[PDB]
Design a protein around this nucleic acid. Structure first.
Ligand SMILES: C[NH+](C)c1cc(NC(=O)CNC(C)(C)C)c(O)c2c1C[C@H]1C[C@H]3[C@H]([NH+](C)C)C(O)=C(C(N)=O)C(=O)[C@@]3(O)C(O)=C1C2=O
Ligand SMILES: [Mg+2]
Ligand SMILES: [Mg+2]
Ligand SMILES: [Mg+2]
Ligand SMILES: [Mg+2]
Ligand SMILES: [Mg+2]
Ligand SMILES: [Mg+2]
Ligand SMILES: [Mg+2]
Ligand SMILES: [Mg+2]
Ligand SMILES: [Mg+2]
Length: 226
RNA sequence: CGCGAGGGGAGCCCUAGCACAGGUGCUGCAUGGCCGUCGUCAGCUCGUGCCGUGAGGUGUUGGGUUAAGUCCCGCAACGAGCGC
């Protein structure tokens, strides 16, 4: 499906961030300062949204596995129910320095979760002395917390998808190294040369987030028939 | 072995000689092992990654908690080995 100027506005996509927390390189992308706090030119989001949906549509036509990254406390459970719909892997909880330049060292920890789900199915768990029982219990949920999106990541992703290229300019800097392409949603407080496929729009607007994912995760499934 | 007096042989015994035995002679500052001790103190480290040109750091630190590196939260870390 398609998208217009009309729809983006109501979301708060022109609604940039401050001038006091501000990245100069973000130049090209603005209108002005109606009350000191910037206004994004959406006739230059129509530019970097076309191109940055084409690139997503190709990847769902050559069936790509796209990471989802949002840790900003509003983002999270919208990263979530917008990756789940997509069939995806998502880091909603808290990124780990490694999870890309160390996928092994990390992924020795998935299997330790997948082993522990199955350990808890069987009866042999109850046999272990109940000190370990509650103890080794704790470790189950720890892993379900910070990974219930990582699990379905069995290898390294074809593109990572950020909502804040400055909070997780960590993540972005991993897929920098291991030549993955980057797909970011960025306001003004964010270096925009550190992204190949980029959306200028709101960082923290729980309705700007909301439209953009739920319109991305369409030109995923539509491009994977369904 | 022999019919036989009795010679040969193994053991052990003595005398003489030789291998050598034996030493609580030395050095714990040439060692083994075992012991004491800082100390039953919560500490000591490695892997992969991250960060510095590097020695190195990160991890193990900060805040909360614990008889404890015990654990909870945070963090460029994630776990494991010897301790608890
Ligand atoms: C006197 N100094 C030159 C000395 C010499 C030797 N060894 C030699 O000279 C042997 N060298 C050869 C190899 C034979 C040429 C030594 O072997 C020693 C010492 C130092 C002592 C000191 C001792 C001391 N108290 C118990 C008398 C002491 O307070 C301690 C301590 N740190 O608490 C010791 O270490 C001590 O007992 C000690 O070990 C010494 C020597 O071993
Ligand atoms: Mg000594
Ligand atoms: Mg002495
Ligand atoms: Mg001495
Ligand atoms: Mg103790
Ligand atoms: Mg280096
Ligand atoms: Mg930790
Ligand atoms: Mg230490
Ligand atoms: Mg520190
Ligand atoms: Mg421990």
């Amino acid at each position: 499906v398609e998208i217009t100027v009309k729809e983006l506005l109501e979301a708060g996509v022109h609604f940039g961030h401050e001038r006091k927390r501000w990245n100069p390189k973000f130049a090209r992308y603005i209108y002005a300062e109606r009350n000191g706090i910037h206004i994004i030119d959406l006739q230059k989001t129509m530019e970097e949204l076309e191109r940055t949906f084409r690139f997503i549509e190709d990847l769902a036509m050559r069936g790509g596995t796209i990471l989802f990254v949002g840790t900003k406390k509003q983002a999270q459970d919208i990263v979530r129910m917008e990756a789940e719909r997509a069939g995806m892997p998502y880091v909603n909880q808290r990124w780990l320095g490694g999870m890309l330049t160390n996928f092994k060292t990390i992924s020795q920890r998935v299997h330790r979760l997948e082993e522990l789900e199955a350990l808890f199915a069987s009866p042999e768990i109850e046999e272990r002395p109940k000190k370990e029982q509650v103890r080794l219990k704790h470790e189950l949920e720890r892993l379900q917390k910070y990974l219930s999106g990582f699990r379905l990541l069995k290898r390294l992703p074809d593109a990572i998808f950020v909502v804040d290229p400055t909070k997780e300019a960590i993540a972005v800097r991993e897929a920098r190294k291991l030549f993955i392409p980057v797909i970011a949603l960025a306001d003004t407080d964010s270096d925009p040369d550190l992204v190949d496929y980029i959306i200028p729009g709101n960082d923290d607007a729980i309705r700007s987030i909301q439209l953009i994912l739920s319109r991305a995760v369409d030109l995923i499934i539509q491009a994977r028939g369904g």
